[PDB]
Symmetry: D2
Subunit: 99 residues, 4 copies
């Protein structure tokens, strides 16, 4: 459940490429999203919410109007997990739709 | 209120082009949407929900898993008003983001 | 999977008490909810939608402004399953808070 | 409409009373909510989201699973206003409906 560099090295890339980035002193990824508006932003969170509930993996996230910042780290391992990756992947599917 | 003639025959045609039909036995229009899953189906509903509350115009919708069926009519006038109109168009635009 | 009669007799009453009721032409439970407004109704759909997804069991539902009708049946058995019942149980919980 | 000092005294009270706080640094009130789970947490955001939109007054909130931090201030007049107040009040009703 914890990211071994081989994994990181194979997983991280596609995310990094679209904007994901690792933080300092904490094993987690972050990304800022910026929609045109709230309708879109919320709709975007809603779909994420559904899935989060579906996989039992939650994001750390902030919102103001049309911006949403997301942070992903798994609680047990206390860093990244295959879980962060998928959620993230999923998130990406959703973001592009609105945009 | 109560779209007259011309407008009707100015405004609706665009909606019909897009699959909107006229309800038989009521002054309404309706259309059904089919999505890949519920995640899309609900997310779609939410965004339409924020808008409805915002305009103070609510649809009559039915949902099952990935299908969403929508009826639009104005209760005040017991029929199609421009309210319905705009809502539909917005709904269409939302449609597109997920379809 | 499909409820036996012993089963129905065990689970049903509690729901029947509350206001749920078998359908006439089919093996499902129905219940119509009424709220003060849309905010509330939509709010309540949101909580069940989350729940619906968590356990992959969805409802046939209908909404207009502040009313919500919910029909439950486990499709795969083509009638009542436990799913329907748990779900119904949950819908009851959500419903009581917005009282 | 950056609320007067007279105005503050009359409105804040009920708010102050419930745990709402004023921030040093900026004209804004804040509050941290805690729920039993994400479902509630999210069902909560949703109702709020609906009001936010209706009003055209959005929050600055962060969520991580079951708690949500809310920050209200009015961009328009760079400080607290009748709105943040109204809104905040509303947030409180919604919160109550969460068990
Ligand atoms: C039991 C535990 O609450 C559950 O497995 C969850 N864990 C986590 C979660 N979300 C994150 N980010 N990390 C977790 O460890 N949501 C659900
Ligand atoms: C005051 C009133 O109930 C409010 O403006 C609403 N009107 C309407 C509505 N929805 C419809 N379809 N028609 C209305 O006239 N939802 C909200
Ligand atoms: C694949 C299938 O659509 C999926 O397993 C679902 N099944 C069911 C469902 N909801 C109910 N009530 N019953 C099901 O059998 N929603 C999701
Ligand atoms: C046009 C303008 O962006 C709009 O009226 C909004 N204003 C505000 C808002 N949110 C806050 N907190 N303050 C505002 O002045 N969300 C929407």
């Amino acid at each position: 459940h914890r990211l071994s560099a081989e994994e990181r090295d194979q997983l991280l890339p596609n995310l990094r490429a679209v904007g994901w980035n690792e933080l300092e002193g904490r094993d987690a990824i972050f990304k800022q999203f910026h929609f045109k508006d709230f309708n879109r932003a919320f709709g975007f969170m809603t779909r994420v919410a559904l899935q989060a509930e579906k996989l039992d993996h939650h994001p750390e996230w902030f919102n103001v109007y049309n911006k949403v910042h997301i942070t992903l780290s798994t609680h047990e391992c206390a860093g990244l997990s295959e879980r962060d990756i998928n959620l993230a992947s999923f998130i990406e599917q959703v973001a592009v739709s609105m945009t």
